[PDB]
Ligand binder design. Structure first.
Ligand SMILES: NS(=O)(=O)c1nnc(-c2ccccc2Cl)s1
Ligand SMILES: [Zn+2]
Length: 257
């Protein structure tokens, strides 16, 4: 089974998921001098005032915060998108050291971690149908750098002890993801894929230019999670990121200059 270790990590994924060597894989390095400013691009419209979080889960490769997506509560529109995309979950990728952990890079710089807010296009009716479409998903990517604490993130940090191992879940209601956004919503966008198996090429990536900062203590607590299940040999949940993939025949567009 796939993972991030030496014997089952990203370099092995292609043997069970040949789309891993596909033409629109993610993540990629954003070359800021090669990105094209596109003034046709609209501002992002993030409407999270009615988000309903439900649960937080350790799924064995990351932890997920899940939302009720049975109606248009928390939605993303605008930017390069056509239609309404509903939030279904968010998760992070992070490193064992502060100098690595993000999946996207900016002029080959790595950040300490990367936040993914996953949304699906309501025109396809449910999430499983949306991953089958080239415009099915929109993922908002936010970089984390280590600096001052992010107060909005502490509620998440404090519950991690209760979901330390794979398969553990905890009620997680009334969390407002607005607390995780940077001040500016300027972005880069490109067509890409899920960054874990099954690696489907169904994602319109929206990566925010401005990182958010979190303390060292906050990311420290991320690194205390376990990839393993309870009762199993302890394997710390670190470096759950996929390295940059070739851009191929793609253009990254910028919403700003
Ligand atoms: N890292 S990510 O946001 O591109 C992502 N990759 N895989 C994802 C996924 C895979 C299977 C089921 C649900 C999801 Cl949300 S979400
Ligand atoms: Zn992700």
């Amino acid at each position: 089974h796939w993972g991030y270790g030496k014997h089952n990590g990203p370099e092995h994924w292609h043997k069970d998921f040949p789309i891993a060597k596909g033409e629109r894989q993610s993540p990629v390095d954003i070359d800021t001098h090669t990105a094209k400013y596109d003034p046709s691009l609209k501002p992002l419209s993030v409407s999270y005032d009615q988000a309903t979080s439900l649960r937080i889960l350790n799924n064995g490769h990351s932890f997920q915060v899940e939302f009720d997506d049975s109606q248009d509560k928390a939605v993303l529109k605008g930017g390069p998108l056509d239609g309404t995309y509903r939030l279904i979950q968010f998760h992070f990728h992070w490193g064992s050291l502060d100098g690595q952990g993000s999946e996207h890079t900016v002029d080959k710089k790595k950040y300490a971690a990367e936040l993914h807010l996953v949304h699906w296009n309501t025109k396809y009716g449910d999430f499983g149908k949306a991953v089958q479409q080239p415009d099915g998903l929109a993922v908002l990517g936010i970089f984390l750098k280590v600096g001052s604490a992010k107060p909005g993130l502490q509620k998440v940090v404090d519950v991690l002890d209760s979901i330390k191992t794979k398969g553990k879940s905890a009620d997680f209601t009334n969390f407002d993801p607005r607390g995780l956004l940077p001040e500016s919503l300027d972005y880069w966008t490109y067509p890409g894929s899920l960054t874990t198996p099954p690696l489907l090429e169904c994602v319109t990536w929206i990566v925010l230019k401005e990182p958010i900062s979190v303390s060292s203590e906050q990311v420290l607590k991320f690194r205390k999670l376990n990839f393993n299940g309870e009762g199993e040999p302890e394997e710390l949940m670190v470096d759950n990121w996929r390295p940059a993939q070739p851009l191929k025949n793609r253009q990254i567009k910028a919403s700003f200059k």
